[PDB]
Amino acid sequence: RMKYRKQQRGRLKGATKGGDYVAFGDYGLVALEPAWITAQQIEAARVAMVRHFRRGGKIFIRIFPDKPYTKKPLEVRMGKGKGNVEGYVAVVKPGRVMFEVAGVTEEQAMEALRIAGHKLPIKTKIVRRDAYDEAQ
Amino acid sequence: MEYRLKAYYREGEKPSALRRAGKLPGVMYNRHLNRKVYVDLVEFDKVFRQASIHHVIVLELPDGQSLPTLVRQVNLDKRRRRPEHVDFFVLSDEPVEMYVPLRFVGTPAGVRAGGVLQEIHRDILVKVSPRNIPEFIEVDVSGLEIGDSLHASDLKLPPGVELAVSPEETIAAVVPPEDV
Amino acid sequence: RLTAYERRKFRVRNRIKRTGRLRLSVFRSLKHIYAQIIDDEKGVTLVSASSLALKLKGNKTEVARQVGRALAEKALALGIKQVAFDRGPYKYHGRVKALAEGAREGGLEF
RNA sequence: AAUCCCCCGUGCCCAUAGCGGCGUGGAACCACCCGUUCCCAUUCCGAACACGGAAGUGAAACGCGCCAGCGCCGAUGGUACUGGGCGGGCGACCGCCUGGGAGAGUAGGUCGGUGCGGGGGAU
RNA sequence: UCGAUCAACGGAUAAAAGUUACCCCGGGGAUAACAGGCUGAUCUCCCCCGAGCGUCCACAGCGGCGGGGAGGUUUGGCACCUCGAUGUCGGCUCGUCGCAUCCUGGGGCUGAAGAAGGUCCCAAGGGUUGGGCUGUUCGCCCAUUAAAGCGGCACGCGAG
RNA sequence: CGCCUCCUAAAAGGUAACGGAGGCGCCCAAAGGUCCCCUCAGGCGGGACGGAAAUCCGCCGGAGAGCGCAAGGGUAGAAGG
RNA sequence: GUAGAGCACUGAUAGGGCUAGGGGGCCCACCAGCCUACCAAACCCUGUCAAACUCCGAAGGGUCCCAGGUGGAGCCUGGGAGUGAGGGCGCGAGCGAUAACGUCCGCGUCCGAGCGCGGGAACAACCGAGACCGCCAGCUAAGGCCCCCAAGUCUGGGCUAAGUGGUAAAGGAUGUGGCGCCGCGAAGACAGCCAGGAGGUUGGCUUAGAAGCAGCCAUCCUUUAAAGAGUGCGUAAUAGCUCACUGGUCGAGUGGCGCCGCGCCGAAAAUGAUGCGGGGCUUAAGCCCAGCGCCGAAGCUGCGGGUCUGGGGGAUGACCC
């Protein structure tokens, strides 16, 4: 994971929709019904992919290790300053533009994702480049 | 090639209903003369899809006034895909804003090379070219490795010239699998 | 930019807040010089100081004191009867000290 | 006297009154300009401010006009949001009815429009 | 117009610490402890994906990484029943249901020759020993045994 | 366990939480008056004792340097020098 | 000014181009070259987040005056007071594990304190609805009409058939039905059929063997059933097998990926069993859309009465509106 040299301790909780979509290579994994996702799990996929792909030609990225999740205590009784930092991860909720390359050229990439996310943690879908995009 | 069926009514209620039948809102626009014409998707799409259609305009039929146009904007649909409003501009004669389809061949020294593959960043060019841009503006080389990269500078510009883009900034570059 | 321009806009805004109703705008330099009267930007502007009716470009900060006293009475009656002050692109010792005394008699009336 | 026009000032409008590029005016403006005993001034110099005047020039500050490259402006549509009433789902949550309905995103837009005093510019 | 952590800051006094299993009086489950309740922490059982072990063979035997539920046990969360009263352990005696079944069988599978193991799905039928030491149920140990299960019922049982 | 500042007060204002954060229980005799002047850090280019960074020259700049002290507001049309 | 939003304010951060700070660099006294090995102020482009970041900006809410404005409240003066702890539901933030019939605050309703009726089985707060008192009167909510029990085992058009009804996810699948789509060379289809499965195809290593059916790639040719750089049972190569092809055989429709709505596997319990019970699956069912119809509240109307309050005639009553 990576949410290094943060700045604060913790966030809060909500969820509902955002701004992920594009393309960025044509080997895409897009979420759909999630929320936050373990930076770890994340790396999981990272691995899954990386390894499948004859183990070399790079994939890309997508979301980030974003926030700090806290179960606070360890199992006590509740009233801590709610302190304790512990699990860091992504906050993606409306089918998000999760972008992963390599040069698989195929349903091979497919598999890669297949497992990566099948795994990961939600109802989600995948594809390629479908309606470009024009900027300034 | 393209065409459509107009909206007398417009804005919300209407485009929604459109959707309902299988029609998405459409903006027909030409240098400060504007009209809301509406989108019959299915076909609409096949068309768009051509994509060659999105890069290099086409002709549309409305009422019976065959005219020249492209997409200058589009609201494609949040919760999935498909759209929320398709946007086209019909041209007079000075087309400067051109993201012409671009193709280039990084003839081997890439993946057959040190494993490294080539990353396509620009792939298209928003330069200038009035009512004159090909379905394929292109360029070529034979290196894709080391820590190699090339862009808008190297470029190599054809006929209806004019770089509305920038002094080079990455058409493409090559990265290693587990290095080279 | 903001620098010298401000020299200006500063005597400006301060002068401006000041409010005893009117202000004459003197203006330094030789033929350059000339001072016009104003009030609230009601829109109006009382009378105009000295149309370059040259009297002695010589060592005459007095060319000044004169044009001044002149404008002094000019307005004095020009616009019946009133009291206020003015601008100035500088302290009152030379050109400007001058427009000053000019005004000075303008009000003094003796 | 009281017509528009050139302007020197000096006013409302906050960047289409901006940056910057080409030009261009002194006749008359006005600027730099000349010099400094005299007002008065630089913790150094009249650099600025200042006094003290022909000149020389219009380089520089400078005013309009052409140029939109950067910047500024930044609609029509369009989605998100949602004020209110109802549904659909154990669910985190989705969706339906009725008014409001920015942003960014191609348009395309601009290189100010003017308040008043006035040297005066055209019997 | 001065003295003032009256600084537990609206400040009883100037001037104050303790300890009670020796204790005693008022009311509240508006607060713990037992258990119950709901939650599930969770632990237990199960289910996905496969990096990957299984000479060869991904998955006969296995699962990295990450993931997804079942259940009400274990270590917890809460406060409403209860403080005009609900006896908490260990064991005894009589036990009653439950299956993720230990022995039983019926099974497909094997890396299954036989035999014997081991690998899952079906099925509670009966059955599911003695002692040792430990107040401990758990446990470790002696001897066997077809086998010598996990657990529900305030961790069943004081009106026994 | 008193007070100031920011979040959550969810847009008026305004509210807990053993909710997040973080300061003060000084002074400044002249940071107290007003008059007159001035006008940032930082970027770049060129320079004695330099020599990442003084001091000076030359450009550049919604002012992000600045204002005893924390935050926030403001704000160099200075409250700033 | 939170939602949104955007990124230029600050802070993040992901793939990118240029750049230096650590460096190879030795020519090693005009001491400067490629590489770059560099952390990049950076760099612009590609990228998404922020309650305590924001260049933009609402959805309402705040409020001043004019106007609606009578229910009936609205105002000020005044004596008699009770709670000073409460819970639930919905939305919005805390927290808690985004757990709990948890606890914190707020907008609303609520429930107590009326919230006594309907109701959903029965259930303080979930949808309907305000009970002053009558009626062997009728219209209705919600939500219902085979039966247990008032009300069509209505009609119409479908889709499931597992009993889903009669709680569950991850996820799995030649379920069921539906798209909006692909193969039809009647130059008569696919599974079923017949026969040939052709000669250079004969190392490249290894040849103990590749002489497709042993490992490191070969991607050519002739040649016709049209051609397997041979997908496959294999050992010692080799030798034999099904079509990947007709070629002929048949011909007349075949194998698919996306998107759909309705089901199954996944989902094992403790006194006994269960959609409420009987029950029921082309009305009897259930899910979806269509329309009609009757049921059922102290809710609403009609015979009447009681009662207080403004006003109305106040004669004492009183009566009536």
Of B149, B154, B152, which is closest to residue B173 (Cα–Cα)? B149
What distances in angstroms separate CA A89 from CA A86, A92, B50, C33, one per listed residue? 10, 10, 39, 73
Q: Which two tokens stand for residue B11?
A: 């804005």
Q: Which two tokens stand for residue B136?
A: 């394929």
Could you give the CA distance from residue B71 to residue B79 in angstroms, rounded to a whole number? 22
Of A49, A79, A73, A74, which is closest to residue A61 (Cα–Cα)? A49
Q: Tell me the three state secondary structure of residue C21.
A: coil
By CB atoms closer than 10 A (0-12, 13-18, 19+), residue A133 is exposed
Could you give the CA distance from residue B33 to residue B11 in angstroms, rounded to a whole number? 17
Helix (H) or strand (E) holding C2: helix C2-17
Of A100, A10, A26, which is closest to residue A63 (Cα–Cα)? A100
Three-class HEC string of A9-53 = CCCCCCCCCCCCCCCCCCCEEECCCCEEEEHHHHHHHHHHHHHHC
Task: Quickly count: other Cβ atoms within 10 Å of residue B143's Cβ.
Answer: 16
Residue type, C20: G
Confirm if A98 and A20 have CB atoms less than 8 A apart. Answer: yes
Query: What are residue B59's phi and psi, to 5 degrees?
Result: -95, 135
Could you give the CA distance from residue B26 to residue B3 in angstroms, rounded to a whole number? 11
The separation between the first and the last C-alpha atoms of chain C, rounded to the nearest angstrom, is 45
Taking an 8 Å cut-off on Cβ atoms, the answer to whether A58 and B175 are in contact is yes
Phi-psi region of B9 (alpha: psi -120 to 50; beta: other; left: phi over 0): beta
C42 touches strand F (CB under 7 A): no
Taking an 8 Å cut-off on Cβ atoms, the answer to whether A57 and B81 are in contact is no
Q: Which two tokens stand for residue A125?
A: 């879908």
Pick from B54, B80, B177: CB nearest A56: B177
What distances in angstroms separate CA B69 from CA B1, B27, B90, one per listed residue? 10, 11, 4
Q: Which two tokens stand for residue B68?
A: 């020249």
Query: HSE of C42 in the Cβ direction (CA atoms, 13 Å)?
Result: 9
Of A130, A120, A135, which is closest to residue A62 (Cα–Cα)? A120
Secondary structure letter of residue A61 according to DSSP = B
Largest CA distance in chain C: 45
- Could you tell me which residues of chain B have a Cβ less than 8 Å from any Cβ in chain A? 48, 51, 54, 71-74, 76, 78-81, 83, 99, 111, 115-117, 119, 126, 175-178
Residue whose structure tokens are 């105009």: C48
Q: Tell me the three state secondary structure of residue A68.
A: strand
By CB atoms closer than 10 A (0-12, 13-18, 19+), residue B120 is middle
**Distance, CA of C37 to C1' of F79, in Å:** 32
Confirm if B1 and B68 have CB atoms less than 8 A apart. Answer: no
Pick from B81, B99, B115: CB nearest A134: B99
A18 touches B at CB < 8 Å: no
CA distance B165 to chain A (A): 10
Could you give the CA distance from residue B63 to residue B37 in angstroms, rounded to a whole number? 10
Could you give the CA distance from residue C110 to residue B90 in angstroms, rounded to a whole number? 81
Confirm if B59 and B66 have CB atoms less than 8 A apart. Answer: yes
A130 touches B at CB < 8 Å: yes
Query: HSE of A71 in the Cβ direction (CA atoms, 13 Å)?
Result: 6
The pairing of strands B33-40 and B23-30 is antiparallel
Phi-psi region of B179 (alpha: psi -120 to 50; beta: other; left: phi over 0): left
Task: Quickly count: other Cβ atoms within 10 Å of residue C6's Cβ.
Answer: 12
Nearest nucleotide to the CA of A38, by C1', is E66
> What is the strand order of the sheet A35-38 is part of?
A35-38, A87-92, A67-69
By CB atoms closer than 10 A (0-12, 13-18, 19+), residue C79 is middle
Q: Tell me the three state secondary structure of residue A116.
A: helix
Phi-psi region of B122 (alpha: psi -120 to 50; beta: other; left: phi over 0): alpha
Query: Cα–chain-centroid distance for residue B175?
Result: 26
Of A52, A23, A74, C62, which is closest to residue B124 (Cα–Cα)? A23
Secondary structure letter of residue C47 according to DSSP = -
The angle subtended at Cα B51 by Cα B49 and Cα B53, nearest 5°, is 105
Name residues whose C-beta falls within 8 Å of residue C102's C-beta, 6 or more positions apart in sequence. Answer: C64, C65, C66, C67, C68, C69, C70, C71, C72
Buried b (16+ CB within 10 A) or exposed e, A55-92: ebbbbeebbbbbbbbbebeeeeeeeeeeeeeeebbbbb
Buried b (16+ CB within 10 A) or exposed e, B145-163: beebbbbbeebeeeebeee
Query: Cα–chain-centroid distance for residue B47?
Result: 13
C9 touches strand F (CB under 7 A): yes
Could you give the CA distance from residue A78 to residue A68 in angstroms, rounded to a whole number? 19
**Distance, CA of B129 to C1' of G105, in Å:** 62
Confirm if B143 and B109 have CB atoms less than 8 A apart. Answer: yes
